[PDB]
Design an enzyme around this catalytic site. Structure first.
Site, PDB file in Angstrom:
ATOM      1  N   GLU A  20      -3.494 -12.750 -15.171  1.00 57.77           N
ATOM      2  CA  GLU A  20      -3.579 -14.199 -15.246  1.00 57.77           C
ATOM      3  C   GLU A  20      -3.841 -14.763 -13.859  1.00 57.77           C
ATOM      4  OE1 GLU A  20       0.450 -15.679 -16.395  1.00 57.77           O
ATOM      5  OE2 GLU A  20       1.067 -13.637 -15.853  1.00 57.77           O
ATOM      6  N   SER A  33      10.606 -20.247  -0.432  1.00 57.49           N
ATOM      7  CA  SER A  33      11.984 -19.948  -0.814  1.00 57.49           C
ATOM      8  C   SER A  33      12.350 -18.500  -0.496  1.00 57.49           C
ATOM      9  CB  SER A  33      12.194 -20.239  -2.298  1.00 57.49           C
ATOM     10  OG  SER A  33      13.457 -19.755  -2.723  1.00 57.49           O
ATOM     11  N   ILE A  57       3.931  -8.798 -16.202  1.00 53.58           N
ATOM     12  CA  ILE A  57       4.072  -9.624 -17.392  1.00 53.58           C
ATOM     13  C   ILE A  57       4.967 -10.824 -17.149  1.00 53.58           C
ATOM     14  CG2 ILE A  57       3.589  -7.703 -18.951  1.00 53.58           C
ATOM     15  CD1 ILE A  57       6.590  -7.655 -19.609  1.00 53.58           C
ATOM     16  N   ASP A  58       5.796 -10.810 -16.108  1.00 54.61           N
ATOM     17  CA  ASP A  58       6.461 -12.041 -15.705  1.00 54.61           C
ATOM     18  C   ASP A  58       6.786 -11.956 -14.226  1.00 54.61           C
ATOM     19  OD1 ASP A  58       7.531 -14.562 -15.822  1.00 54.61           O
ATOM     20  OD2 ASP A  58       9.375 -13.979 -16.837  1.00 54.61           O
ATOM     21  N   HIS A  61       4.142 -15.448  -9.591  1.00 51.80           N
ATOM     22  CA  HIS A  61       4.244 -16.170  -8.320  1.00 51.80           C
ATOM     23  C   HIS A  61       5.202 -15.491  -7.348  1.00 51.80           C
ATOM     24  CE1 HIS A  61       2.795 -19.325 -11.166  1.00 51.80           C
ATOM     25  NE2 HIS A  61       1.968 -19.542 -10.158  1.00 51.80           N
ATOM     26  N   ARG A  62       6.247 -14.829  -7.847  1.00 53.13           N
ATOM     27  CA  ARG A  62       7.090 -14.026  -6.967  1.00 53.13           C
ATOM     28  C   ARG A  62       6.279 -12.899  -6.360  1.00 53.13           C
ATOM     29  NH1 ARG A  62      10.060 -14.296 -11.426  1.00 53.13           N
ATOM     30  NH2 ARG A  62      10.710 -12.148 -11.881  1.00 53.13           N
ATOM     31  N   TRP A  98      -3.005 -40.973 -17.028  1.00 53.37           N
ATOM     32  CA  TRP A  98      -3.290 -41.056 -15.598  1.00 53.37           C
ATOM     33  C   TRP A  98      -3.733 -39.726 -15.001  1.00 53.37           C
ATOM     34  CZ3 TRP A  98       0.128 -44.151 -18.069  1.00 53.37           C
ATOM     35  CH2 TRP A  98       0.093 -45.517 -17.766  1.00 53.37           C
TER      36      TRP A  98
END
Lengths: 254, 254
Positions: A20, A33, A57-58, A61-62, A98
């Site tokens: 992805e 962070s 799969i998850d 971003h980490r 908007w």
């Protein structure tokens, strides 16, 4: 439960693939962070593929944050196929009027008409729904997705909601609904070196390991001494591992 | 769910009652840990009873530790009846024939007779069961539970197994099976100032709030001016809260 210990591994960063795209804004906040805390709170969740590789799969971003921070190994939890099912995220766009990106992308052949085909994308407001089908679409299925998602994703404000959850919209909202993929489609996407849009695949995973808090320093070099250190670290952590089998609300901070 | 916020409360320590005996060995390690950390990791789980009082359903040793440390209010999570079910623990004694505390007790009217009354306690082995019925016993169910449980609790090794769990006794096992109580019975018990023996009731609770890490400084003085701090504290923690609906393996350490 040593069965979980054996699935927590340090994997060379170049052996891990994404299926992805990612949202660079979220990438940068997650990365800030991690750098501040000098810890990765949760392992990235991966499955084995081919060529000795792994697919996130998850935790995209980490993982991207760690790659960007110069890590050579990634702490992963290897997920078996029996532990997960594949759903999707719907994208709720607050004050969706908007939101200039989708606000007049007219050309795609949206239609309120319903047919027994499968509506690829569905666009919702409090009153109405619109559909897209490849009977009308010129380009292939996945670049429609990239186009549509990307029109509002990085520009407008989005909150992702599970495709199975009950949600009712205000009159400010627009809800984008995307149909879940089968694992074979995702696998083909990765094998062809392609990606689905950011934030649309949603893996429902049983047996997540949480709050591992891997020190960033362990991830910088690939030396098997570092691997002995990793096994020591892990053995220290497992002693504090407790299994929960009902819904929990976890405070992810301290 | 933001309902969690309303269910997390500071309750005066003198308005809370236990329904089961506590193991002081475990109480001392919990007390130790809380003192070291200066925080309570998980809220005490309670249900409302009568006279504006609360009954602990999980966290006996956290609660007793807090009271021992001089806390005037306990951080609790108020569980509603739709959130929990009540089961029991069976006590599996490997090589029970060599558990002296359980064998020398020739007095009790153990019996293989299957009657239409439900037995107080059932003692199983691989191919035969024994029972204790009201009719053969002069004193109450609870006195007998405490007598029988304490005959082997400290004396012999015991594995606590959920009553609904699947268990196949090895050749030399002995299994003590205790009735799951209804909430009415547990309440009656607490109302008479009595307690059930430790390690027999088993509450299955959905929606536990975890890792709140309440600072101990907030629990020593019970003044309305403390509540503000509490609420502040709470609203901060909730912004790091996340719901997990599948089984998790949580590392309860940092």
């Amino acid at each position: 439960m040593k069965q979980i210990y054996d699935t927590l591994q340090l994997i060379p960063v170049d052996k891990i693939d994404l299926h992805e795209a990612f949202e660079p804004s979220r990438l940068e906040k997650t990365k800030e962070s991690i750098a501040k805390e000098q810890h990765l709170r949760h392992p990235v969740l991966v499955v084995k593929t081919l060529f000795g590789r792994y697919m996130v799969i998850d935790g995209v971003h980490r993982f991207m944050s760690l790659k960007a921070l110069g890590c050579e190994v990634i702490p992963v939890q290897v997920i078996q196929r029996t532990q997960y099912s594949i759903g999707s995220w719907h994208h709720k766009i607050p004050n969706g009027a908007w939101c200039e990106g989708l606000t007049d992308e007219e050309l795609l052949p949206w239609t309120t008409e319903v047919r027994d085909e499968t509506p690829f994308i569905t666009m919702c407001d409090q009153q109405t729904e619109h559909y897209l089908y490849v009977a009308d679409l010129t380009v292939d299925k996945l670049d429609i997705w990239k186009k549509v998602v990307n029109s509002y994703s990085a520009s407008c404000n989005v909150e992702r909601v599970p495709h199975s959850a009950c949600l009712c919209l205000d009159s400010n909202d627009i809800l984008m609904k995307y149909q879940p993929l089968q694992i074979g489609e995702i696998e083909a996407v990765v094998q062809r070196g392609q990606t689905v849009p950011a934030g649309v695949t949603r893996f429902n995973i049983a047996g997540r390991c949480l709050n591992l808090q891997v020190p960033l320093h362990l991830l910088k070099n690939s030396n098997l001494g570092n691997q002995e250190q990793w096994h020591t670290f892990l053995q220290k952590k497992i002693e504090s591992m407790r299994c929960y089998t009902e819904k929990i609300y976890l405070i992810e901070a301290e």
